[PDB]
Amino acid sequence: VKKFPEGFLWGVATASYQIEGSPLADGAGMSIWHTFSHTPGNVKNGDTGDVACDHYNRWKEDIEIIEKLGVKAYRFSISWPRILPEGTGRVNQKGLDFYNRIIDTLLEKGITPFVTIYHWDLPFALQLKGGWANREIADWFAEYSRVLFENFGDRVKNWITLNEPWVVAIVGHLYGVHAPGMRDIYVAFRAVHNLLRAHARAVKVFRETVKDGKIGIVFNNGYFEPASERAVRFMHQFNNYPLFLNPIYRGDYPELVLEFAREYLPENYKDDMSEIQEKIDFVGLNYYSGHLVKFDPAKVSFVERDLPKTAMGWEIVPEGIYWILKKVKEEYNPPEVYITENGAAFDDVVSEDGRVHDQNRIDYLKAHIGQAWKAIQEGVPLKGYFVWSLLDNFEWAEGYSKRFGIVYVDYSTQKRIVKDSGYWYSNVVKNNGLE
Numbered sequence: 365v366k367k368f369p370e371g372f373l374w375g376v377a378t379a380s381y382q383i384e385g386s387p388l389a390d391g392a393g394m395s396i397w398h399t400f401s402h403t404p405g406n407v408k409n410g411d412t413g414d415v416a417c418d419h420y421n422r423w424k425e426d427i428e429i430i431e432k433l434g435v436k437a438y439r440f441s442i443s444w445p446r447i448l449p450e451g452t453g454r455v456n457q458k459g460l461d462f463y464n465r466i467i468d469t470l471l472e473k474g475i476t477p478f479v480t481i482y483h484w485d486l487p488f489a490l491q492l493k494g495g496w497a498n499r500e501i502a503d504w505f506a507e508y509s510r511v512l513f514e515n516f517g518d519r520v521k522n523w524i525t526l527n528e529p530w531v532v533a534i535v536g537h538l539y540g541v542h543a544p545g546m547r548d549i550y551v552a553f554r555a556v557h558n559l560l561r562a563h564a565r566a567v568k569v570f571r572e573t574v575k576d577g578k579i580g581i582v583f584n585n586g587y588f589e590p591a592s593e594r595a596v597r598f599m600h601q602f603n604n605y606p607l608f609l610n611p612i613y614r615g616d617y618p619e620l621v622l623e624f625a626r627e628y629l630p631e632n633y634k635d636d637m638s639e640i641q642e643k644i645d646f647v648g649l650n651y652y653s654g655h656l657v658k659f660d661p662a663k664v665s666f667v668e669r670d671l672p673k674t675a676m677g678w679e680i681v682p683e684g685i686y687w688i689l690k691k692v693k694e695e696y697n698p699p700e701v702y703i704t705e706n707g708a709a710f711d712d713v714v715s716e717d718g719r720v721h722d723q724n725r726i727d728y729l730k731a732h733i734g735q736a737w738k739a740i741q742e743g744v745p746l747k748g749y750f751v752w753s754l755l756d757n758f759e760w761a762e763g764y765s766k767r768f769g770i771v772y773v774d775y776s777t778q779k780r781i782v783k784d785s786g787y788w789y790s791n792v793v794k795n796n797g798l799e
């Protein structure tokens with residue numbers, strides 16, 4: 365048996381735009397994912413977040429599902445434009461009411477809330493003012509954060525500033541695959557820098573406002589391996605937590621990041637580094653996949669390997685999660701770590717028996733939970749693990765076509781069907797580990 369520490373946090377994870385629907389209900393401002401997904405060509409099948417899982421009306425049912433599964437922590441995000449429709453200034457009481465009911469319900473049912481302040485749904489009003497490209501976002505984010513702390517900090521004690529700022533900056537502003545859909549390398553690296561400055565301003569306000577809670581930040585990570593026998597060192601420093609943690613902990617960008625991108629960063633960016641080092645309480649790592657990497661005249665390309673893949677076409681590489689856990693301890697030694705996301709998309713079918721027999725997702729989860737256990741044995745301070753996702757949801761530019769839930773969602777009726785994964789996971793949580 366692989367048993368976890370006493371009081372280890374077993375959780376599930378969602379994001380506001382991915383599950384809620386009703387993006388303009390009760391005075392909410394538009395977000396950039398609303399305008400981006402309503403632009404033809406940007407999202408698979410013309411899918412948008414207009415309805416999604418209808419969690420905006422079905423929130424109680426979904427929480428009752430979390431409770432019924434015995435899952436102990438729920439990671440969810442707040443939609444900035446529900447709270448402040450123009451991004452700054454006016455506060456919308458109905459948006460606060462929405463998350464207040466979610467928060468109180470979780471606490472009643474003994475589920476611990478983990479709130480992601482920013483999970484990609486920037487108010488459109490602020491995008492008009494440049495969004496992450498604008499230095500003033502540090503102030504706009506700080507004021508948004510202050511609102512959340514004041515309203516919810518009496519009850520929510522675990523906070524995440526940003527979800528995957530690498531994706532926000534690079535996929536949003538260089539690849540243009542995500543909102544706001546831009547393809548400018550200089551904008552993209554100014555967004556990296558501003559995401560850091562905004563994160564740090566939010567931490568600073570947190571210390572002044574919620575004197576008994578904890579705050580951290582979440583990164584996407586890949587397990588990169590070299591094709592022959594440096595481009596791997598780069599991918600780690602650039603795609604993984606070092607891009608942000610080197611500034612946070614060491615006061616500058618990683619070495620290979622500066623080699624590639626010094627010219628794209630603002631000229632006096634080092635002026636902001638002392639503020640950027642605002643102390644954080646934990647590091648959240650997301651992990652999904654491994655990649656084989658070769659040098660190639662960003663001077664990097666991926667080499668496809670055989671290996672089982674998910675419906676995303678992501679190579680299943682469970683040892684990556686142990687690696688990334690060991691490497692973060694080794695490189696930055698954060699006091700606490702969480703796996704804030706881990707999961708897989710598979711082509712899920714409801715059998716005639718009414719169940720979803722996702723043995724592939726179970727194999728995926730079990731393999732990665734084992735590897736996280738190992739890192740705990742070898743001393744990594746991992747305090748929690750979060751499955752992405754509770755529900756099948758809007759998977760960004762893939763639309764509804766990728767299913768990550770441990771609960772199946774039938775979109776034509778909004779019926780939730782717990783998958784074999786969910787039941788299996790429920791048992792892991794109950795036992796506090798693998799049997």
Ligand SMILES: O=C(O)c1c[n+]2c([nH]1)[C@H](O)[C@@H](O)[C@H](O)[C@H]2CO
Nearest residue numbers: 379527528584585650652752759
């Ligand atoms: O780092 C990643 O690969 C990654 C995967 N995911 C994410 N980041 C985001 O945090 C979620 O909003 C996604 O829906 C989820 C599944 O694609």
